Amino acid sequence: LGSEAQRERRKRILDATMAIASKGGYEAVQMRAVADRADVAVGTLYRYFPSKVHLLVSALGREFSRIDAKATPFQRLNFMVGKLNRAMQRNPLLTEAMTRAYVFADASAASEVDQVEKLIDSMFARAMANEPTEDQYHIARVISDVWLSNLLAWLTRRASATDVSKRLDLAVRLLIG
Amino acid sequence: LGSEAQRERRKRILDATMAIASKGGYEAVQMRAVADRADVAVGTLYRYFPSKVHLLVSALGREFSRIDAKAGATPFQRLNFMVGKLNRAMQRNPLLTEAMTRAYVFADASAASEVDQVEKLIDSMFARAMAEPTEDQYHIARVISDVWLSNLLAWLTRRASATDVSKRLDLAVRLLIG
DNA sequence: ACTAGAACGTGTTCTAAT
DNA sequence: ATTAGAACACGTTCTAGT
């Protein structure tokens, strides 16, 4: 949990982190900069987040939970996949920071990276049924795998956004056949 | 291409990368150590490979090429065979897998041509396993590659066991073939 | 516990000298 | 084009003070 002061500090830290990530991407999210923008000390920043990976991944978790607050299965899956497709193109640098930290994480951040993962799959399952079944969760997991792979292909400028939408529609079509 | 001594320098660099990564993993393959083991200066190492990511992904491409130089009844059984080879080699040298895989996913646009070079190969290996593969077999192969990378990351992060990865990959295979 | 600043490790670049 | 090494940039840790 934590006190109100600690909650304020944390919020300021993650807000600064997502700001600098937005303007400059992963390499711009520097710990001295994130600490300076949140008006914290660096040792405070590392007290609240043990590594840069933990920081960006926790920001990704907060953002995806916030997005979690607010027809045919291919239609609802196309709606979610298009929402996250346009959301990927919305801020490419922020997506670069959060995604790259998500995949570069080591075992020390496993728990964090797991939560995010388990939540995202959950959304993909909640976007297929208005409670889901077992097979819906499985297809959701495979879909999320293809979305991560194609997201990495786009962020590294080896696949266009049209290519991402095409290959993920190919994945959903391959699963719903 | 380069001179003959330049080719030998590149090979020695990549062999040093493979050895250090095998013995210690991603944090162990350090540029000074790689340069010293390869008997080159760090500036030379950076002339041959512009970044640590380019270095490790290049070793990855070399390895998967040598594997390309070298399987069942159903394409279900052939796909399961290649998946099993990938799992067994994965646990065979987990620190080398951690090094090259984390360099692969952490990679930059600077190394796009490298990351694209490996991916298209691994896809070409999953497709040619099911096969002259169809375009449908190629799309299935690509989805399989994606779930294999996801579960590979989960296993290297100690958030999935080997049996979890095997179960999820076979599950994906059944969801894709039938 | 928060702040300020020093300091250490490692990826990456720069210098001097061939 | 290569080498030995210094120097720089950023993640990370540690010390002293409030």
Side-chain angles (χ1 to χ4, degrees), chain A residues 2-3 5-6 9 11-22 24-26 28-46 48-57 59-65 68-69 71 73 77 82 85-89 91-114 116-117 119-125 127-129 132 135-136 138 140 142-156 158-159 161 163-164 168-171 174-175 177, chain B residues 2 4-6 8-11 13-22 24-26 28-46 48-69 71-76 78-81 83-85 87-91 93-119 121-127 129-131 133-135 137-157 159-165 167 169-178:
Chain A
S3 69
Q6 300 170 345
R9 312 232 157 75
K11 165 166 178 51
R12 284 198 329 258
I13 293 174
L14 293 118
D15 289 334
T17 305
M18 290 197 56
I20 310 167
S22 292
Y26 177 90
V29 190
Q30 304 185 8
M31 302 305 266
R32 297 171 178 86
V34 171
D36 188 74
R37 192 169 191 89
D39 296 322
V40 282
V42 160
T44 303
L45 160 81
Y46 276 85
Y48 281 88
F49 298 95
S51 87
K52 169 174 169 171
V53 156
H54 286 265
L55 176 67
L56 282 171
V57 170
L60 179 68
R62 185 177 84 163
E63 203 51 49
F64 264 136
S65 89
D68 198 31
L77 270 188
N85 199 310
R86 276 170 291 117
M88 151 197 75
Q89 305 188 54
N91 205 165
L93 293 189
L94 175 62
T95 295
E96 190 234 24
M98 294 181 309
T99 306
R100 277 254 293 276
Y102 173 87
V103 289
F104 188 49
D106 71 327
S108 57
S111 168
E112 281 78 4
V113 174
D114 193 73
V116 172
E117 188 189 33
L119 184 266
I120 271 52
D121 294 334
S122 172
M123 304 171 98
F124 276 103
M128 301 176 78
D135 299 325
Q136 287 165 311
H138 296 152
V142 178
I143 284 298
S144 82
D145 293 4
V146 188
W147 162 247
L148 174 64
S149 163
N150 276 104
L151 180 52
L152 295 194
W154 181 76
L155 278 173
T156 39
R158 50 193 170 87
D163 284 326
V164 176
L168 241 194
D169 284 31
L170 253 171
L174 270 161
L175 282 154
Chain B
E4 190 192 4
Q6 273 138 25
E8 163 80 21
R9 275 188 213 90
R10 196 178 293 107
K11 167 170 172 56
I13 284 181
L14 284 184
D15 293 334
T17 311
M18 300 282 313
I20 298 165
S22 307
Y26 182 86
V29 46
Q30 309 184 351
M31 296 318 257
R32 300 163 172 83
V34 173
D36 293 327
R37 182 84 100 87
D39 274 309
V40 292
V42 178
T44 291
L45 164 61
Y46 272 84
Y48 284 72
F49 299 100
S51 76
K52 176 176 177 179
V53 167
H54 296 71
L55 175 71
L56 281 157
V57 179
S58 272
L60 187 58
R62 200 182 64 166
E63 281 318 305
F64 273 130
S65 284
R66 320 162 144 190
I67 299 187
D68 200 75
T74 324
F76 164 76
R78 314 170 201 140
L79 211 42
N80 281 335
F81 185 87
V83 159
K85 191 176 300 292
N87 222 35
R88 277 185 300 273
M90 157 196 105
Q91 331 175 49
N93 204 147
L95 298 179
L96 185 72
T97 298
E98 180 248 353
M100 296 184 304
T101 303
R102 269 177 79 201
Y104 174 93
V105 290
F106 184 61
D108 199 21
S110 323
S113 66
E114 282 86 353
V115 186
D116 209 274
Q117 182 179 133
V118 278
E119 181 186 44
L121 184 37
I122 286 87
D123 292 345
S124 181
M125 303 185 106
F126 277 123
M130 310 183 65
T134 326
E135 43 177 340
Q137 289 185 351
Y138 198 80
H139 306 335
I140 292 175
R142 294 194 288 183
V143 176
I144 285 301
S145 296
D146 299 0
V147 314
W148 161 248
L149 169 64
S150 176
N151 292 262
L152 189 53
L153 274 184
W155 177 77
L156 291 165
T157 326
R159 38 188 179 94
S161 84
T163 51
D164 288 324
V165 172
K167 284 176 179 170
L169 254 74
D170 174 79
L171 187 45
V173 163
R174 298 157 50 197
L175 291 189
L176 286 184
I177 292 188

PDB file of all heavy atoms in Angstrom, chain A residues 2 4 26 28 32-34 54 58-59 63 67 86 90 95 97 105 119 128 136 149 163 165 170-171, unseen atoms left out:
ATOM      1  N   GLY A   2       0.967   1.906   1.157  1.00  0.00           N
ATOM      2  CA  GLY A   2       1.779   3.100   1.281  1.00  0.00           C
ATOM      3  C   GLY A   2       0.994   4.328   1.696  1.00  0.00           C
ATOM      4  O   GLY A   2      -0.218   4.403   1.475  1.00  0.00           O
ATOM      5  N   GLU A   4       0.032   8.552   1.905  1.00  0.00           N
ATOM      6  CA  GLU A   4      -0.356   9.495   0.861  1.00  0.00           C
ATOM      7  C   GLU A   4       0.862  10.199   0.276  1.00  0.00           C
ATOM      8  O   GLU A   4       0.924  10.443  -0.937  1.00  0.00           O
ATOM      9  CB  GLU A   4      -1.353  10.513   1.414  1.00  0.00           C
ATOM     10  N   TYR A  26      13.220   5.176 -25.255  1.00  0.00           N
ATOM     11  CA  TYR A  26      13.859   4.377 -24.210  1.00  0.00           C
ATOM     12  C   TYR A  26      15.170   5.001 -23.745  1.00  0.00           C
ATOM     13  O   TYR A  26      15.410   5.142 -22.541  1.00  0.00           O
ATOM     14  CB  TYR A  26      14.083   2.949 -24.719  1.00  0.00           C
ATOM     15  CG  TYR A  26      14.807   2.034 -23.751  1.00  0.00           C
ATOM     16  CD1 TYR A  26      14.104   1.269 -22.829  1.00  0.00           C
ATOM     17  CD2 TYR A  26      16.194   1.923 -23.770  1.00  0.00           C
ATOM     18  CE1 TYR A  26      14.759   0.430 -21.947  1.00  0.00           C
ATOM     19  CE2 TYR A  26      16.857   1.090 -22.891  1.00  0.00           C
ATOM     20  CZ  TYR A  26      16.136   0.341 -21.983  1.00  0.00           C
ATOM     21  OH  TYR A  26      16.793  -0.494 -21.105  1.00  0.00           O
ATOM     22  N   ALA A  28      16.106   7.992 -23.833  1.00  0.00           N
ATOM     23  CA  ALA A  28      15.911   9.273 -23.166  1.00  0.00           C
ATOM     24  C   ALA A  28      15.469   9.109 -21.717  1.00  0.00           C
ATOM     25  O   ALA A  28      15.718   9.999 -20.896  1.00  0.00           O
ATOM     26  CB  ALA A  28      14.892  10.114 -23.931  1.00  0.00           C
ATOM     27  N   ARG A  32      18.682  10.125 -13.909  1.00  0.00           N
ATOM     28  CA  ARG A  32      18.876  11.490 -13.426  1.00  0.00           C
ATOM     29  C   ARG A  32      17.792  12.419 -13.960  1.00  0.00           C
ATOM     30  O   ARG A  32      17.318  13.310 -13.246  1.00  0.00           O
ATOM     31  CB  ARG A  32      20.262  12.005 -13.822  1.00  0.00           C
ATOM     32  CG  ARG A  32      21.437  11.246 -13.215  1.00  0.00           C
ATOM     33  CD  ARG A  32      22.744  11.697 -13.855  1.00  0.00           C
ATOM     34  NE  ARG A  32      23.924  11.051 -13.286  1.00  0.00           N
ATOM     35  CZ  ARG A  32      24.399   9.873 -13.679  1.00  0.00           C
ATOM     36  NH1 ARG A  32      23.788   9.194 -14.640  1.00  0.00           N
ATOM     37  NH2 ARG A  32      25.484   9.369 -13.106  1.00  0.00           N
ATOM     38  N   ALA A  33      17.384  12.221 -15.216  1.00  0.00           N
ATOM     39  CA  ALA A  33      16.349  13.063 -15.808  1.00  0.00           C
ATOM     40  C   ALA A  33      14.989  12.780 -15.184  1.00  0.00           C
ATOM     41  O   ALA A  33      14.238  13.708 -14.859  1.00  0.00           O
ATOM     42  CB  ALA A  33      16.302  12.852 -17.321  1.00  0.00           C
ATOM     43  N   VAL A  34      14.651  11.498 -15.019  1.00  0.00           N
ATOM     44  CA  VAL A  34      13.375  11.133 -14.408  1.00  0.00           C
ATOM     45  C   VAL A  34      13.311  11.633 -12.970  1.00  0.00           C
ATOM     46  O   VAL A  34      12.263  12.098 -12.503  1.00  0.00           O
ATOM     47  CB  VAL A  34      13.162   9.610 -14.493  1.00  0.00           C
ATOM     48  CG1 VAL A  34      11.959   9.193 -13.669  1.00  0.00           C
ATOM     49  CG2 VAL A  34      12.996   9.175 -15.943  1.00  0.00           C
ATOM     50  N   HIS A  54      12.327  -1.860 -14.093  1.00  0.00           N
ATOM     51  CA  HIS A  54      11.195  -1.862 -13.169  1.00  0.00           C
ATOM     52  C   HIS A  54      10.354  -0.603 -13.327  1.00  0.00           C
ATOM     53  O   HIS A  54       9.120  -0.651 -13.255  1.00  0.00           O
ATOM     54  CB  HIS A  54      11.693  -1.981 -11.727  1.00  0.00           C
ATOM     55  CG  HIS A  54      12.186  -3.347 -11.363  1.00  0.00           C
ATOM     56  ND1 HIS A  54      11.384  -4.288 -10.753  1.00  0.00           N
ATOM     57  CD2 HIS A  54      13.402  -3.923 -11.503  1.00  0.00           C
ATOM     58  CE1 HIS A  54      12.084  -5.387 -10.541  1.00  0.00           C
ATOM     59  NE2 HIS A  54      13.311  -5.194 -10.989  1.00  0.00           N
ATOM     60  N   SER A  58       6.621  -0.776 -14.734  1.00  0.00           N
ATOM     61  CA  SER A  58       5.555  -0.343 -13.836  1.00  0.00           C
ATOM     62  C   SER A  58       4.704   0.746 -14.482  1.00  0.00           C
ATOM     63  O   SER A  58       3.482   0.789 -14.284  1.00  0.00           O
ATOM     64  CB  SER A  58       6.146   0.140 -12.512  1.00  0.00           C
ATOM     65  N   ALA A  59       5.331   1.631 -15.263  1.00  0.00           N
ATOM     66  CA  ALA A  59       4.564   2.617 -16.020  1.00  0.00           C
ATOM     67  C   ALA A  59       3.668   1.942 -17.051  1.00  0.00           C
ATOM     68  O   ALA A  59       2.523   2.362 -17.265  1.00  0.00           O
ATOM     69  CB  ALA A  59       5.509   3.613 -16.694  1.00  0.00           C
ATOM     70  N   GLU A  63      -0.394   2.186 -17.118  1.00  0.00           N
ATOM     71  CA  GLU A  63      -1.081   2.654 -18.318  1.00  0.00           C
ATOM     72  C   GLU A  63      -2.075   1.620 -18.832  1.00  0.00           C
ATOM     73  O   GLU A  63      -3.189   1.971 -19.242  1.00  0.00           O
ATOM     74  CB  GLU A  63      -0.061   3.006 -19.399  1.00  0.00           C
ATOM     75  CG  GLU A  63      -0.585   3.983 -20.430  1.00  0.00           C
ATOM     76  CD  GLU A  63      -1.212   5.209 -19.797  1.00  0.00           C
ATOM     77  OE1 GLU A  63      -0.575   5.814 -18.908  1.00  0.00           O
ATOM     78  OE2 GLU A  63      -2.346   5.564 -20.182  1.00  0.00           O
ATOM     79  N   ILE A  67      -6.114   1.930 -19.111  1.00  0.00           N
ATOM     80  CA  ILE A  67      -6.858   1.589 -20.318  1.00  0.00           C
ATOM     81  C   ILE A  67      -7.853   0.465 -20.062  1.00  0.00           C
ATOM     82  O   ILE A  67      -8.846   0.342 -20.789  1.00  0.00           O
ATOM     83  CB  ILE A  67      -5.896   1.210 -21.459  1.00  0.00           C
ATOM     84  N   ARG A  86      -3.758   1.550 -33.407  1.00  0.00           N
ATOM     85  CA  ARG A  86      -3.727   3.008 -33.344  1.00  0.00           C
ATOM     86  C   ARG A  86      -3.066   3.522 -32.076  1.00  0.00           C
ATOM     87  O   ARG A  86      -2.419   4.576 -32.120  1.00  0.00           O
ATOM     88  CB  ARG A  86      -5.144   3.578 -33.446  1.00  0.00           C
ATOM     89  CG  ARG A  86      -5.660   3.736 -34.875  1.00  0.00           C
ATOM     90  CD  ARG A  86      -7.143   4.060 -34.867  1.00  0.00           C
ATOM     91  NE  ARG A  86      -7.932   2.919 -34.416  1.00  0.00           N
ATOM     92  CZ  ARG A  86      -8.684   2.915 -33.322  1.00  0.00           C
ATOM     93  NH1 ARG A  86      -8.748   3.999 -32.559  1.00  0.00           N
ATOM     94  NH2 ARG A  86      -9.361   1.824 -32.983  1.00  0.00           N
ATOM     95  N   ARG A  90       0.111   5.949 -31.810  1.00  0.00           N
ATOM     96  CA  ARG A  90      -0.206   7.219 -31.163  1.00  0.00           C
ATOM     97  C   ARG A  90       1.058   7.915 -30.672  1.00  0.00           C
ATOM     98  O   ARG A  90       1.331   9.066 -31.031  1.00  0.00           O
ATOM     99  CB  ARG A  90      -1.180   6.985 -30.006  1.00  0.00           C
ATOM    100  N   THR A  95       5.786   3.987 -26.675  1.00  0.00           N
ATOM    101  CA  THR A  95       5.665   2.562 -26.958  1.00  0.00           C
ATOM    102  C   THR A  95       7.034   1.900 -27.028  1.00  0.00           C
ATOM    103  O   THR A  95       7.216   0.778 -26.543  1.00  0.00           O
ATOM    104  CB  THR A  95       4.901   2.359 -28.269  1.00  0.00           C
ATOM    105  OG1 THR A  95       3.552   2.817 -28.115  1.00  0.00           O
ATOM    106  CG2 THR A  95       4.889   0.892 -28.668  1.00  0.00           C
ATOM    107  N   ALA A  97       9.869   2.816 -25.460  1.00  0.00           N
ATOM    108  CA  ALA A  97      10.424   2.685 -24.117  1.00  0.00           C
ATOM    109  C   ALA A  97       9.750   1.557 -23.344  1.00  0.00           C
ATOM    110  O   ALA A  97      10.421   0.652 -22.828  1.00  0.00           O
ATOM    111  CB  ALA A  97      10.290   4.010 -23.366  1.00  0.00           C
ATOM    112  N   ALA A 105      13.610  -7.119 -19.808  1.00  0.00           N
ATOM    113  CA  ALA A 105      13.649  -7.398 -18.379  1.00  0.00           C
ATOM    114  C   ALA A 105      14.280  -8.756 -18.093  1.00  0.00           C
ATOM    115  O   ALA A 105      14.164  -9.702 -18.877  1.00  0.00           O
ATOM    116  CB  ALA A 105      12.242  -7.352 -17.794  1.00  0.00           C
ATOM    117  N   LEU A 119      -2.312  -9.473 -17.410  1.00  0.00           N
ATOM    118  CA  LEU A 119      -3.412  -8.539 -17.606  1.00  0.00           C
ATOM    119  C   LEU A 119      -3.738  -8.388 -19.086  1.00  0.00           C
ATOM    120  O   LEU A 119      -4.914  -8.399 -19.470  1.00  0.00           O
ATOM    121  CB  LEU A 119      -3.072  -7.187 -16.977  1.00  0.00           C
ATOM    122  CG  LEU A 119      -4.150  -6.097 -17.003  1.00  0.00           C
ATOM    123  CD1 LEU A 119      -3.986  -5.177 -18.204  1.00  0.00           C
ATOM    124  CD2 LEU A 119      -5.553  -6.705 -16.956  1.00  0.00           C
ATOM    125  N   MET A 128     -13.135 -10.976 -26.374  1.00  0.00           N
ATOM    126  CA  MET A 128     -13.718 -12.044 -27.176  1.00  0.00           C
ATOM    127  C   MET A 128     -15.076 -12.505 -26.675  1.00  0.00           C
ATOM    128  O   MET A 128     -15.875 -13.005 -27.469  1.00  0.00           O
ATOM    129  CB  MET A 128     -12.773 -13.252 -27.229  1.00  0.00           C
ATOM    130  CG  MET A 128     -11.402 -12.941 -27.805  1.00  0.00           C
ATOM    131  SD  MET A 128     -10.264 -14.341 -27.750  1.00  0.00           S
ATOM    132  CE  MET A 128     -10.850 -15.324 -29.127  1.00  0.00           C
ATOM    133  N   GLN A 136     -10.712 -19.533 -25.309  1.00  0.00           N
ATOM    134  CA  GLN A 136     -10.626 -18.101 -25.581  1.00  0.00           C
ATOM    135  C   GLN A 136      -9.380 -17.497 -24.944  1.00  0.00           C
ATOM    136  O   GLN A 136      -8.730 -16.627 -25.538  1.00  0.00           O
ATOM    137  CB  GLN A 136     -11.888 -17.396 -25.084  1.00  0.00           C
ATOM    138  CG  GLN A 136     -13.120 -17.670 -25.938  1.00  0.00           C
ATOM    139  CD  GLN A 136     -14.411 -17.276 -25.247  1.00  0.00           C
ATOM    140  OE1 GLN A 136     -14.644 -17.628 -24.091  1.00  0.00           O
ATOM    141  NE2 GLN A 136     -15.261 -16.542 -25.957  1.00  0.00           N
ATOM    142  N   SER A 149       5.454  -9.797 -31.058  1.00  0.00           N
ATOM    143  CA  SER A 149       6.459  -9.993 -32.100  1.00  0.00           C
ATOM    144  C   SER A 149       6.351  -8.927 -33.186  1.00  0.00           C
ATOM    145  O   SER A 149       7.357  -8.335 -33.597  1.00  0.00           O
ATOM    146  CB  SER A 149       6.321 -11.392 -32.695  1.00  0.00           C
ATOM    147  OG  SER A 149       7.000 -11.490 -33.934  1.00  0.00           O
ATOM    148  N   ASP A 163       1.739  -3.714 -42.402  1.00  0.00           N
ATOM    149  CA  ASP A 163       2.223  -5.087 -42.286  1.00  0.00           C
ATOM    150  C   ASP A 163       1.837  -5.694 -40.943  1.00  0.00           C
ATOM    151  O   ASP A 163       1.478  -6.874 -40.866  1.00  0.00           O
ATOM    152  CB  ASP A 163       3.741  -5.130 -42.472  1.00  0.00           C
ATOM    153  CG  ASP A 163       4.157  -4.989 -43.923  1.00  0.00           C
ATOM    154  OD1 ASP A 163       3.418  -5.470 -44.807  1.00  0.00           O
ATOM    155  OD2 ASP A 163       5.229  -4.400 -44.181  1.00  0.00           O
ATOM    156  N   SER A 165      -0.808  -4.876 -39.002  1.00  0.00           N
ATOM    157  CA  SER A 165      -2.235  -5.178 -39.057  1.00  0.00           C
ATOM    158  C   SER A 165      -2.509  -6.393 -39.935  1.00  0.00           C
ATOM    159  O   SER A 165      -3.375  -7.217 -39.615  1.00  0.00           O
ATOM    160  CB  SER A 165      -3.007  -3.960 -39.566  1.00  0.00           C
ATOM    161  N   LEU A 170      -3.956 -11.982 -40.059  1.00  0.00           N
ATOM    162  CA  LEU A 170      -3.656 -13.342 -40.491  1.00  0.00           C
ATOM    163  C   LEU A 170      -3.585 -14.298 -39.309  1.00  0.00           C
ATOM    164  O   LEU A 170      -3.965 -15.467 -39.434  1.00  0.00           O
ATOM    165  CB  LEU A 170      -2.337 -13.365 -41.263  1.00  0.00           C
ATOM    166  CG  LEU A 170      -2.394 -13.561 -42.776  1.00  0.00           C
ATOM    167  CD1 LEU A 170      -1.021 -13.340 -43.385  1.00  0.00           C
ATOM    168  CD2 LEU A 170      -2.912 -14.949 -43.104  1.00  0.00           C
ATOM    169  N   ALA A 171      -3.093 -13.827 -38.161  1.00  0.00           N
ATOM    170  CA  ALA A 171      -3.039 -14.677 -36.976  1.00  0.00           C
ATOM    171  C   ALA A 171      -4.436 -14.950 -36.431  1.00  0.00           C
ATOM    172  O   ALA A 171      -4.786 -16.100 -36.138  1.00  0.00           O
ATOM    173  CB  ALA A 171      -2.156 -14.032 -35.907  1.00  0.00           C
TER     174      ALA A 171
END
